[PDB]
Ligand binder design. Sequence first.
Ligand SMILES: O=c1ccn([C@@H]2O[C@H](COP(=O)(O)NP(=O)(O)OP(=O)(O)O)[C@@H](O)[C@H]2O)c(=O)[nH]1
Ligand SMILES: [Mg+2]
Ligand SMILES: [Mg+2]
Ligand SMILES: [Mg+2]
Lengths: 745, 740, 482
Amino acid sequence: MDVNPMLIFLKVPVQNAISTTFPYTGDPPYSHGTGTGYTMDTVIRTHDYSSRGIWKTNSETGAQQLNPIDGPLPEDNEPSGYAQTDCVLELIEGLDRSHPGLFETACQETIDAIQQTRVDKLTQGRQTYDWTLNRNQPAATALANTIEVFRKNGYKLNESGRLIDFLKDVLLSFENDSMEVTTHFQKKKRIRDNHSKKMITQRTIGKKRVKLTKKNYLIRALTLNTMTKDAERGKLKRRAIATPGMQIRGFVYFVELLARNICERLEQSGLPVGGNEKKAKLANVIKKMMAKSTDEELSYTITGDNTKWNENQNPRIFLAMVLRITAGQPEWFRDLLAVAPIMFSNKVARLGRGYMFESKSMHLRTQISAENLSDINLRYFNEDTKKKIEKIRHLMVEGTASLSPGMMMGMFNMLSTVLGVSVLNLGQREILKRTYWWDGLQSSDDFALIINGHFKEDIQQGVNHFYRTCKLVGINMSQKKSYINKTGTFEFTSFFYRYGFVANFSMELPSFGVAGNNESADMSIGTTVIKTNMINNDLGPATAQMAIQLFIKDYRYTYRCHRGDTNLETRRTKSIKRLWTETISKAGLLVADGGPNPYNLRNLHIPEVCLKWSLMDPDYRGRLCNPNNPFVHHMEVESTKSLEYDAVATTHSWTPKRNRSILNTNQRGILEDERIYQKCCQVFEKFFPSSTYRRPIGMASMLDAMLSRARIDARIDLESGRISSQDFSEITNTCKAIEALKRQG
Amino acid sequence: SGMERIKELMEMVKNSRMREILTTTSVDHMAVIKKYTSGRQEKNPALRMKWMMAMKYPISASSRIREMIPEKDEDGNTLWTNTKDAGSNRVLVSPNAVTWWNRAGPVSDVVHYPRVYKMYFDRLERLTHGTFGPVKFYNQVKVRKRVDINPGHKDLTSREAQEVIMEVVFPNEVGARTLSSDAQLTITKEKKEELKNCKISPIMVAYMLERELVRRTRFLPIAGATSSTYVEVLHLTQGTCWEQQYTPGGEAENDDLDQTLIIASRNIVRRSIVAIDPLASLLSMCHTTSISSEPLVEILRSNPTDEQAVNICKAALGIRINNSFSFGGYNFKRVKGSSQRTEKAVLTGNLQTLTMTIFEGYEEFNVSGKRASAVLKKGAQRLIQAIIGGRTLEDILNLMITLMVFSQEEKMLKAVRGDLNFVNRANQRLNPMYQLLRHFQKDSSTLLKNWGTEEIDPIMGIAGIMPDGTINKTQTLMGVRLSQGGVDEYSFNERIRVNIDKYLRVRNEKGELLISPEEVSEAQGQEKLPINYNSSLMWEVNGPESILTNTYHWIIKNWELLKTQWMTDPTVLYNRIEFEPFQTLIPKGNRAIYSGFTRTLFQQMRDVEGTFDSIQIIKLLPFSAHPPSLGRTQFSSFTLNIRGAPLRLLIRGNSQVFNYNQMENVIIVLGKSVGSPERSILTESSSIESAVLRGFLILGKANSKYGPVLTIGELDKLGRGEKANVLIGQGDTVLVMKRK
Amino acid sequence: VSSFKANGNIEAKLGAMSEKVNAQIESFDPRTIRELELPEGKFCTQRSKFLLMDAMKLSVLNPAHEGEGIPMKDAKACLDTFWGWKKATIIKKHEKGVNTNYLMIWEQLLESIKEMEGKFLNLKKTNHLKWGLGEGQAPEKMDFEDCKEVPDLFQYKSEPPEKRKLASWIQSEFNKASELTNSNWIEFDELGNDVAPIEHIASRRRNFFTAEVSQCRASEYIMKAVYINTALLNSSCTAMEEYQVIPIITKCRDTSGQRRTNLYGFIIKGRSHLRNDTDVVNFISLEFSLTDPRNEIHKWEKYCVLEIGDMEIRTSISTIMKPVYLYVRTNGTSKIKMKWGMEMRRCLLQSLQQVESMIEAESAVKEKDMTEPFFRNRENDWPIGESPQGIEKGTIGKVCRVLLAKSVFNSIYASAQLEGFSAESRKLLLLIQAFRDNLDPGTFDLKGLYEAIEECIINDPWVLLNASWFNSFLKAVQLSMG
RNA sequence: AAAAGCAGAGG
RNA sequence: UAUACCUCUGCUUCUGCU
RNA sequence: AGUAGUAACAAGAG
Ligand SMILES: O=c1ccn([C@@H]2O[C@H](COP(=O)(O)NP(=O)(O)OP(=O)(O)O)[C@@H](O)[C@H]2O)c(=O)[nH]1
Ligand SMILES: [Mg+2]
Ligand SMILES: [Mg+2]
Ligand SMILES: [Mg+2]
């Protein structure tokens, strides 16, 4: 008998057994190599869908920019980027007219948040294109290098600690003709490896001074570094993602904050809510949309997705939307909120790392960069890369490629949600006054669209009307990945509604494992993951008990901390058995110390050091929760082998070893400033205790804050009986000598 | 004493690079240079922990451990090695050093774990002394609500608790921020009294106070109790198909117990009005009911909560009534006049559509609580007079603001400035009166400026307040007089003995009608503590959707006997008490005409032979449980009230409420399956439909031989033998025949 | 934009646009849609990291030697119970590979197993082992600036995978994987005391689940893959240069309660200096087997099979003597594949959740726990297979083992073809579901949907089997309306 | 009715 | 020259290694 | 060779 699991769907409905259709127990698809081909394919598709637009050369950058807005109306069912701006403005105007007072309150919220916001809000990003280094750096170091290059020129407004002064300096920086940066460079030499007896190359990374020209800095400030996306499920082919830099992220933050304030107060946006709040909002607006319909009306639902969404939007459409939303607002508000579509319309896309080129008479491989792909003769590339370089060659501006149309992968998620919500809003029956009307939800590009009509032909006309109205604004519904059915069952952002949102346990299956922090945090994470999946994702009681057993097995085999009655032989077996045999109450030992599992379905919310506190030996809990714990960090005793505070952490809260080494690469030239910065933060925190708890606020230099703090604390210690007058004179003389060293260096 | 850190700073200021960083980087830019990295970062720490435990030393620790842990074990294992390049304050540590510290380390008699993690020990004490009841299996109906995972201080909000935490732990590090409340000052004094000479680090003290005082809320799918001691064990008490009875270890909170008392009493009253004897059903339901495993009839004896549904339960028991309610922190002792509630649609001042319940009728009030007192005459959407008194200047204005919001005119509703949402971020219906109250209690200028002025006769016993605040005895507001003594207290704490009758209307010993069952709010909120109506009049879990699914489940699983009652002697079938909590979701006007429509459909299905559809009996049978009317109309749906929103149940076919899937052969009610009727459906399902229209038989699809199409209410111009087409619903076109 | 007044612009450009821009709803009916187009070509090859249905274990019962737990000691104790070692002779050649290298690799392996004095075994860097592990098959990576004068510097080629054909062995592997055994392969850990009533109910249901799921053959493949990936990860990260020998060893308990150590073969680790997460550590797998490769040779394209022994095999009527082969091949893995292979035990979480929901969805309707009626009243409720008679229905334990084996093979045969196929065929399953709900479904481009589904069915045996399964389910749905 | 980091998922 | 943006959920409060 | 799959690993920047 040939076994077929999908015949299970002959009895169980597909949404009830949907977790079988998610093969999420194997490895996800990774890429191997460069994302240069995916970047080239994104650029080629982006200029393919907008090819009938206006070609014009930018006077500042020189890039061949393509202008598809107000272009010819589409003639086929393909992707099209030709968006009509009067249609976009009519949609934003009708969105305002249906929701009165919304735009003014959102704009006033954003005006009040503009003056509050500091520069460090930009340090909450992951990996940023450092235009100073032409690489990816973390966003804090990218902002730090940007602010250092800015203040090394005559651009010091960001010293006032506000985001908007940094944005004033950003827009003023394009006027500088000869912006000067500090870059990295390697010094290679050949030395012999000793453990393998091979001659290899030793790269030492250093610093270097180089000056950018005006047009080169304008290219690097508009550059979106492109990489390939790893571990994406559900796709056969890979795709490219892009990261912008510090010149653009502040403006995109303010535009997305304004659009977030808009999207929070729209019934038809799935953003920014998420999880159970999203499911509650979706079921409530489904109930409201089915309350708006009558008995005679049909009701269908489009389980929709839009094809090639981010390359078929436009920054010019977003400029029109920003200027129509902020109508009646101040002019500095309109200019500051309109910077970001202008920075996205003149943008430029760095291709990748290049390609690997293979020789056979020399038996060699090498990496020729993406900025060197225009030097190689075309007979060396394979046919697809040859076609891509032929289709892309006229767009190259200093290794990057001109990319005037399209968003390039999701930097305007809420503004795109507003643009889709306007087309959802146009289908009101008092606006349309037709034989059909529609309403729906929209996250960014996904939409559920409930269309009502008196007959099925009116549903067809409503589908056509919605599809053409989306075509007029640059939104192309995927005819492959979308489908329609009667209302009561749909899918929206992998939430499978079947008269109510069913669960999907498999999607949260990669959370079920040992997290890998230390022995205590992993135990809390594993028990809490089982707990929250029992709460939210309909994990059964028996399966949760089996998940406790599987996590205890994985935890013991990971940390080599099996019990004392087991005979497995690890590095820790003799020490754990010595702790096991000498302990009277073995039920109070932690799982990381050979103890038994205390956990069942009722005590998942109680930590393990708490669940076993009554069963511990007094010597064992005096050793485990010892105040002078050497595995954790101790504070220093402030102004109340020096004095420390007592550590409340256990011995299983240790720090795992980190490795930052790069193969054959010495990095003592660029890892030094990080060490000096951490030394400066550590000497600051001895004067200000709360700086670890809540990040401090100020505009004066750290030396002046620390010297004023030392002076006033010496005076309060003098006039409260906690210091002598000789100590007070010593501290004030020291602060005066430091003040003599802050100027007379 | 503070002399070592200044010498550290003088040593770090002589290095010129460090001096440049200390002099050029401000305190706001030190947030940026704190997260500055340069080297390669490592993804996927799970796999790195999977392989790094194979190494001898996967743990890094401070260099002091060279003096607190020996280099070798008894068994010869090396416990640590120094790192290669010297100068670093780190060494590499084996996990055998951890096990050696746990078996032969120094033993300290003081441990800060039970104090810092007091919350988890309180959860453990709640679980250990917790009682477990049986496990029941039925269809859960969970609602994703915002609940407290941390209850916080009752006197503090999260912002005020963070103010208190920054005042207790870091008193020199608050900025230009002062404490506002007396609660914040008292909790700061108490927490400074406890945490003085504390050896715990200030950050750990801050997080201990943060898990004590700060309220945290999450959106969770809740069935039943939403208190913070029933949400902590939410994985244990509820599942997808089962309910685990549980009572924690301790006392129930009073501010939770009063609320679930109100909700329990509202459900008992609203179920009681539908019954044959509302008084006997209320007395049968009130004794078996237990809130948090404590009986209801002995909580009502001692609870001082005064509310129009709690009072009917108390007047049926024999407990003295304080005939009042609460609104905005003030008790409203209504003296004269009886109003009645009606749902209306009100356009607001922010052009916002809003649907409320306004009370039509004349009333007179005696408002008073905790700082002030006022006597109020008020009709339908009108604030006549308000002789407001009190004990300060601000408190009489606060009571004036509260009474102007309570008036519910057309003037305060068109006086809103700014935004005021009446749905939440998850589009859940916020209460409109408290929304307007919290609006007009912070920004109150445009209400007073639109309130205007009125000329009053300058006689004593009445003063006046201007629309700014300067007291004049000639010009006042439009109703706002200042009482020079207020109203007399010591008669608002006085409780009243009361009579009650069969239909739950409360009278005093004089005879003035205090409470009616119509005054009881038909708001469906869910409780903080679990309520167990141990009755044959209420299902297991209450709420509207649970009533729907439990009623349809009971009809489906008893269909073999209910079908036999339907076929012969049906007048005993409709009056069954299991259909009686279903009627609480139909609004009161439609119940008689829905039952008349349903009984006419069932009689036509009996008389027209062969037209049997059991799904059409199951779907409409809980609507026939009301003494009908005779009004010959034509319904295309039956509207029910669920969570403050209507839901339409179509007479023909499937809907969002009641679907019948031929795939699973299962009837789905509100996303939950309630079973197959008897798997006896193949003998049914003919062509002609009988229980859709009142007097007409559906004969297949439409026809062009029989004239143009119609709508539902265009059939009175038809005769016995005239056949026509009807656009019945859901895009269908059917042929329609009249009977003789 | 500040002074824009809408003058009916959208209706104007709706009239001005062409009527070749539309979304025509075409009605969906599964009695009219075609089946998925499986590719054509050569048959599909086994690509797993170990033999599944054909592997043979030398087993010892209740080990009590000097190294009861140490890997190579248990390997030596299991090899000592086989005395049929004859000379190695190749009986099935690897076509693209030097087969005498595989012969000399097994000879060097067995001889160093003989002279093994220690707990570990590192093989010697010989020429045939350096071929079988690929030491030297990389071109030396240079910097472009130092090799600007190379004439033959062409590129790396980016051919797609070649379209293979559905061979019948992968259905046989899934058949043998969903069957019970005479052992217990998962040996769980302890819980706390079941104090709450729901913990008694959960423990009763978990005992049923453990009885049905610990003796399945997919649990044996779970333990083999978890052990192999664990030992390979530890050896790859701690023995980077050395050619470490890793024996495939699992530990089971029989249903009579006695322990057993099974040896399935050996894995010679290669050089492993992995820096990425997709960098491939090469190894050589040598697994004992009894199945002749010359009967289903298309399955064994990458294998060199050399007959290495004899064993007296007992049978149901009498007792015979069979030869013993050794499937040798070069294989490779990465840190991501070893990471996701060490975590194969969550396949138990993927199946046992679903079956539990199948009980719970009944338990809410029956107003009772339906665990014991599902596991004892064997009424054959769920359809899980296709026989020549009709469609075969199994019980909830059979469904539990089938869903276990499906998750296990999703983890063994993980590929981007599987991800794309499942994501694109989920939509077709939802359209068929919407049809069976009488919810009147309809697409706009069904040809593009079929083209996107069939784009992923290329060469993977599991994905080809899943497409065949989809076609069988579609034919069952079409027969259900007859 | 009333701070940041890491991990996982989704888009 | 290499893991983007946004959102939700969960945990933790980190001192910095050829 | 093998892993693999639109470009790589098969040690010498992750
Ligand atoms: O990882 C992600 C996924 C999605 N997105 C954003 O979400 C949008 C829709 O995500 P998508 O998955 O639909 N991809 P799309 O670009 O529409 O092409 P297609 O597969 O043909 O539908 C994308 O266009 C991005 O803007 C991201 O930014 N990052
Ligand atoms: Mg898309
Ligand atoms: Mg979608
Ligand atoms: Mg999408």
